[PDB]
Amino acid sequence: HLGKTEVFLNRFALRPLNPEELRPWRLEVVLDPPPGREEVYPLLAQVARRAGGVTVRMGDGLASWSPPEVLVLEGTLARMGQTYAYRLYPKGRRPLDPKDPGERSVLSALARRLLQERLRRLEGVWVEGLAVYRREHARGPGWRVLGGAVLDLWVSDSGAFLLEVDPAYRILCEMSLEAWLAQGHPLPKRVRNALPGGLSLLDYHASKGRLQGREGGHLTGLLVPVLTLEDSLALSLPWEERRRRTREIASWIGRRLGLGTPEAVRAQAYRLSIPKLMGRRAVSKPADALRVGFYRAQETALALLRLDGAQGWPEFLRRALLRAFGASGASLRLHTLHAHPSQGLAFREALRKAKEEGVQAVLVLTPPMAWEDRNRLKALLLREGLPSQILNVPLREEERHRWENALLGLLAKAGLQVVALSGAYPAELAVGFDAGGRESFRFGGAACAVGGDGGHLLWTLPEAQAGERIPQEVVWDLLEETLWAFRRKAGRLPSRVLLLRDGRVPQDEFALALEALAREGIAYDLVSVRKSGGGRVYPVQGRLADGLYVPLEDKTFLLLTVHRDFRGTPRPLKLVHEAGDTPLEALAHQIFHLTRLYPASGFAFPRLPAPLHLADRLVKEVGRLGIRHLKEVDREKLFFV
DNA sequence: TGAGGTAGTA
DNA sequence: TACTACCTCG
Ligand SMILES: [Mn+2]
């Protein structure tokens, strides 16, 4: 779009596969008794993990880079309450082609096991899975921090080893929960180990043999505190230092594992166009809409609820709002609620009266509330159709970031459009889908930006579902609501929509929706947005920019949407064009620009495009509060930000 | 409950 | 997927 440059990925190309590696051994597996269908492939992979050596499951059999004579061919296996007796028959070598991706899967699996097994025999670094911690730079009062990197090893379509490296840290408590609590450290909110039925506490403990060595002390000397944020030292690295350590560790592991000499891979990068944020006029951040004016503001009524027991609006909030609305060319009406939650139903009555007099949202001035009470209050207001923005009461006028963000949140919750984009984009309706609020079940939800400008953010009623997969009919129904909204604002159907999915798109999840869209004459683009596994991106030379489009393979690409040096090293998004005919650069363009639409964050843009961020917040808040409160809440109002 | 990210933990 | 810590304010 702008300049096409160059980058490094945190992957490294090592030696190609020697002739022992291109033609892996084929092992036919025999179990006794023959398994059960749902439980076969995992059991088979378990067999591969039991024969030792570098072997993986190859379809209905096993593939091995290790000679069959240095594997435990015949063995016994326990699986969730069933004893299997396995035996492996070597059936020669089967040649695999890296160009064939289906077999490249197998080769890459073998590579991963290679990395694992070889990392096992490294003295004397700390090895957990494909991670390795090979130094210490931080200690503590009974806890130390190790420093290394998380790795991966796979094969390319060329047929050579590629090695992904990313600097990491490990938190290690070095004292038993007995000894640790004896040094003078507070109670850990979690603790990994190393009567109502006869056998007493001490008896059942010691007789279980769980007292052979350690002190007395559930127990105390029989567990270990898994320290987290509990017991500072920034574990975030500036991109430069991280890039360096990535190099160093790459070379080290390549050398100390007989994998060769690493060459940092270079990908072609493209600098994307600068988004045109707009309030009443051009802005650089949504917070500037409070001085410049709102993209679209009508006659609005906002109410105040003080729980700290005090007076009216603190003059700076009043004046800020007056500046914002005077600039937006709209009349403002501020109310004060003379009511309190301790009134019982009279409080809900107060809320009902407020709603009936046109109040669109309420600002809650209050000392730090507990999760319980905050939730109850939120939902209670919500049941009268009033979104609420909480602002903590120890609030001085100089804390401008906090209260300008609270104000922005308020305005966003009252149904105002605070910012918009001014450009040319392939889609004029962009909708994001996510599932969350998890537990025994999840909520599948959608949020949308309607119009080319994105000058309209809405949410749809989420739907309870068994897992992460959203039902096809639920997908099409939510999308239908987004469409219907678009037609309510534009008087027509959208020329083209952009479907964004948080995470990988399960098979045929969007089948129904895409068919419907196709019938109505609506062009679409389905894009899967994965927040991780995109690895890292570094400038081959020069400064690290913000707005990077890195087309990798076909239909997939990386996208660096946000970067600020002080926060650490940016993690690019991995995006897959799952369905559609729009060019990748155009989609990257639109998504990157959609990243700036989020109005509730006034001084920092989110990493995800606004509809996905909104969808995330939405399913979280719905899963947290409950869906039962949302019946009388307007969809133009972002109650969940 | 100010918001964002990058870091950590399950 | 959640949660907490620290940094800073496009
Ligand atoms: Mn908020």
Side-chain angles (χ1 to χ4, degrees), chain A residues 291-395 397-437 441-542 544-552 555-563:
Chain A
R291 302 128 196 174
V292 136
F294 303 127
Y295 178 73
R296 198 181 68 261
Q298 50 240 315
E299 184 181 5
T300 77
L302 288 314
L304 182 67
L305 178 77
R306 269 183 168 276
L307 306 183
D308 62 330
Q311 311 279 72
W313 293 79
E315 188 62 26
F316 55 108
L317 300 184
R318 203 179 197 105
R319 281 187 266 115
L321 285 171
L322 258 336
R323 263 193 241 111
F325 279 82
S328 308
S331 47
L332 169 64
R333 175 164 34 101
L334 299 180
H335 297 250
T336 304
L337 291 170
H338 303 292
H340 192 258
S342 53
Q343 284 187 288
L345 290 170
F347 180 57
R348 198 215 228 264
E349 177 56 29
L351 294 166
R352 192 199 65 80
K353 299 205 208 78
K355 162 220 181 63
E356 197 162 73
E357 293 219 4
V359 168
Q360 294 172 359
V362 358
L363 180 66
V364 187
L365 282 192
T366 172
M369 317 186 68
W371 270 104
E372 308 87 298
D373 296 310
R374 178 266 188 190
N375 282 15
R376 281 198 180 101
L377 180 69
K378 281 269 183 160
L380 172 54
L381 293 226
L382 226 48
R383 282 196 306 274
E384 279 297 335
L386 297 160
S388 64
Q389 168 62 52
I390 296 178
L391 187 50
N392 282 343
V393 74
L395 173 75
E397 188 183 356
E398 49 267 22
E399 290 183 276
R400 278 208 147 71
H401 298 101
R402 225 179 66 178
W403 63 261
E404 285 196 8
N405 262 2
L407 254 32
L408 280 192
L410 223 204
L411 298 151
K413 278 161 187 170
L416 268 62
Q417 264 300 291
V418 339
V419 291
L421 302 166
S422 186
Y425 304 107
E428 42 178 358
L429 174 58
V431 32
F433 306 85
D434 188 19
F441 69 101
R442 298 196 166 189
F443 282 104
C448 69
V450 350
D453 40 317
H456 223 106
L457 305 180
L458 314 172
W459 57 272
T460 65
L461 231 208
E463 180 58 80
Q465 59 189 47
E468 168 83 19
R469 162 179 286 268
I470 308 176
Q472 309 188 338
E473 334 108 41
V474 173
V475 171
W476 168 243
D477 289 344
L478 300 193
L479 178 54
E480 183 179 83
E481 280 286 357
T482 63
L483 295 179
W484 220 237
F486 186 89
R487 111 140 189 79
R488 282 205 299 274
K489 286 77 184 177
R492 60 189 179 87
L493 288 180
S495 182
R496 179 175 227 101
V497 317
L498 172 60
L499 299 326
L500 302 172
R501 175 67 212 262
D502 170 85
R504 303 173 63 187
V505 176
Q507 285 284 339
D508 308 316
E509 184 178 69
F510 281 80
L512 210 137
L514 267 25
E515 299 253 357
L517 282 179
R519 297 191 222 104
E520 292 297 332
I522 308 172
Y524 57 85
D525 288 286
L526 216 199
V527 182
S528 170
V529 183
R530 308 120 183 256
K531 310 191 282 281
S532 48
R536 262 53 150 73
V537 163
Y538 302 105
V540 114
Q541 292 177 335
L544 178 55
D546 173 40
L548 264 317
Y549 161 64
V550 190
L552 299 173
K555 294 315 184 67
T556 145
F557 65 100
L558 297 189
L559 189 63
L560 220 170
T561 53
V562 286
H563 171 49

